[PDB]
Design a protein around this ligand. Structure first.
Ligand SMILES: *[C@@H]1O[C@H](CO)[C@@H](O)[C@H](O)[C@H]1NC(C)=O
Ligand SMILES: *[C@@H]1O[C@H](CO)[C@@H](O)[C@H](O)[C@H]1NC(C)=O
Ligand SMILES: O=C(O)[C@@H]1CCCCN1
Ligand SMILES: [Cl-]
Lengths: 29, 573
């Protein structure tokens, strides 16, 4: 199913973005 | 500084209430019969109260709770309630975004899912429900929601909508964490892309066969259904929900503006731009809807002609739509014995009935625009563009709403001294996403219907009524006018004073009285439910447990005001 592949890619990139932003914010403070 | 504030207010106001909610609200309540009150309710309710909110944000120069607490302590509750409503909004609004995500992900396929019905099972025809309804309607009601036939019947949590809602909430949380003041180029971009996409769909939407039927249905003010109090109620509540009145974040936005600014120009411009965007989006939607209605009418006429021709052994092209009644009379006069058998079977179809009952419900925008996409050349590109514009609008509106939710929480030193703001926002998003899973069930569309019509509908009227009475009578309109004149050099116009003091509260009270009287007289609250066997929408009475939630959603937010007054009186005594 192509919709599942696209959703997996999008969710992966969004989760990596959230993780990096939280980690950078915590490390800065 | 004017451009920044004006575009911030526009970006807050222009969202899914303009592109998604307005079209189906207009369709449900008669088209023109809903548009005439809307405009009537915009001059009286929209502009004066939006200006009052923007002025209260400036003369106080505090937050919503701070302002309504500084005017008088006995009133501080209206600052708390204005948060709670936002909560309920953020509880269900995201579901819409989720749906768009779904419709985006099913847009990279050559055989678009809403374009071709599945095979029946013989591999010789189409599905019964997919044929009785449209392919777009079948995709929306079965492939997307899998809607249960009644509210009493619900299954488990559908995992695909749950994942889409989880993804939408993750995107909202990422947008919360990432940016707060970098909207510089975004305001140059996110404000023109919806208009460009609507322009493209208008260029397609006004050249379809029978596009004028949709516009005529839209702009005809039928007097017979213009007397419905529910139409006026829905118009006023949609105005309040689209301008953001009662949510309390407009006061916060205006709190950061200079006191030597013209809030009479800005309020007028924002309200007019919101109205124009709603009208334009609804015009495009109703042009496509009229094309759908014309196609359904032509299909019914063709089916009836084929039925008569296959039986009376008429010529192939002899029986057309321009000579249908005359040939029917001729055939009936020829011999009645044969005509008697199928007379029940011959169906009457007209443009009007199709226009009322072609497509209706909260999925009107999705169904209509998927239909329009399936009639394009490169359907994939236009589907991506439209469902990306919708995603931007929803994400922006939710950023505004969640900022309104979170600012009181961050400003509270009790919570801010224990957990980081990055964790407070995460907890808020997690609670909202976990509670919003009730909209992903099989019967979740009915709960979405309940929340879209009662969570932030009448409470927005009562909050604004209390706010305007507070500003005019408790604080003193003369004192407020003097303060505003000293702040900006110009005294408030007499028209704005008239609309603040008497006209808007009286109209709100009259609307509330009419709605209550209509509900009492009817005594049976009903909702639309999908019927796959009949392939349309039927009206069913709300069950006993559905009225409790409906009552509580309004009651908590509205009654949060009197309870605070009682608590303050107890504290004093
Ligand atoms: C096609 O399927 C229907 C059931 O929906 C059945 O009644 C019909 O006999 C089938 N046609 C043939 C040729 O078997
Ligand atoms: C169609 O119209 C005729 C005459 O007005 C009426 O008798 C009939 O019940 C209607 N409906 C159908 C399905 O024939
Ligand atoms: O137009 C919208 O979609 C938003 C909803 C929230 C309040 C502001 N307007
Ligand atoms: Cl609107």
């Amino acid at each position: 199913s192509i919709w599942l592949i696209v959703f997996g890619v999008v969710m992966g990139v969004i989760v990596v973005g959230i993780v990096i932003l939280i980690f950078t914010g915590i490390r800065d403070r | 500084n004017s451009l920044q504030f004006v575009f911030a207010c526009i970006s807050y106001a222009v969202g899914l209430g303009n592109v998604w909610r307005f079209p189906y609200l207009c369709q449900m309540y008669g088209g023109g019969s809903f548009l005439v009150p809307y405009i009537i309710m915009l001059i009286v309710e929209g502009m004066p109260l939006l200006y009052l909110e923007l002025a209260v944000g400036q003369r106080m120069r505090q937050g919503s709770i701070g302002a309504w607490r500084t005017i008088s302590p006995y009133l501080s509750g209206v600052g708390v309630a204005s948060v709670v409503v936002s909560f309920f909004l953020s509880m269900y609004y995201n579901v819409i975004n989720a749906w768009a995500f779904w419709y985006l992900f099913h847009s990279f396929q050559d055989p678009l899912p809403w374009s071709v019905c599945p095979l029946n099972g013989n591999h010789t025809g189409y599905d019964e429900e997919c044929e009785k309804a449209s392919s777009t309607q079948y995709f929306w009601y079965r492939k997307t929601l899998n809607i249960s036939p009644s509210l009493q019947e619900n299954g488990g949590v559908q995992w695909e909508p749950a994942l889409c809602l989880l993804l939408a909430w993750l995107v909202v949380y990422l947008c919360i964490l990432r940016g707060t003041e970098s909207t510089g180029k975004v305001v140059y971009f996110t404000a023109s892309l919806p208009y460009c996409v609507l322009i493209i769909y208008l260029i397609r939407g006004l050249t379809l066969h029978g596009a004028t039927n949709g516009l005529m249905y839209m702009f005809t003010p039928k007097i017979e259904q213009l007397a419905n109090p529910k139409a006026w109620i829905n118009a006023a509540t949609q105005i309040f929900f689209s301008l953001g009145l009662g949510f309390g974040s407009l006061i916060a936005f205006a709190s950061y503006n200079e006191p030597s600014n013209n809030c009479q120009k800005h309020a007028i411009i924002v309200s007019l731009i919101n109205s124009f965007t709603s009208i334009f989006a609804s015009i495009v939607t109703f042009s496509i809807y009229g094309f759908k209605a014309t196609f359904n009418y032509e299909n019914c006429l063709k089916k009836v002609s084929l039925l008569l021709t296959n039986t009376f052994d008429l010529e192939d092209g002899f029986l057309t739509a321009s000579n249908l009644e005359q040939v029917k009379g001729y055939l009936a006069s020829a011999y009645p014995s044969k005509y008697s058998e199928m007379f029940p079977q011959i169906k009457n179809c007209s443009l009007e009935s199709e226009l009322d009952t072609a497509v209706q419900g909260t999925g009107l925008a999705f169904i209509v625009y998927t239909e329009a996409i399936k009639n394009m050349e490169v359907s994939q590109l236009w589907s991506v563009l439209y469902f990306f514009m919708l995603l931007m609008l929803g994400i922006g509106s939710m950023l505004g709403n969640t900022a309104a939710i979170l600012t009181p929480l961050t400003d509270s030193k009790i919570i801010s001294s224990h957990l980081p703001k990055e964790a407070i926002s995460g907890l808020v998003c997690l609670v909202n996403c976990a509670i919003g899973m009730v909209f992903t069930m099989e019967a979740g569309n009915y709960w979405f219907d309940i929340f879209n019509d009662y969570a932030a509908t009448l409470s927005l009227l009562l909050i604004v009524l209390v706010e305007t009475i507070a500003v005019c009578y408790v604080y003193g309109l003369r004192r407020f006018e003097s303060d505003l004149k000293a702040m900006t050099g110009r005294a408030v116009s007499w028209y704005w004073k008239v609309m603040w003091a008497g006209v808007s509260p009286l109209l709100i009270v009259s609307l509330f009285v009419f709605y209550l009287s209509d509900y009492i007289l009817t005594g049976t609250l009903k909702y639309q439910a999908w019927d796959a066997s009949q392939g349309q929408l039927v009206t069913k009475d709300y069950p006993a447990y559905a009225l409790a939630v409906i009552g509580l959603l309004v009651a908590s937010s509205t009654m949060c005001i009197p309870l605070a007054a009682l608590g303050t009186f107890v504290q004093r005594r």
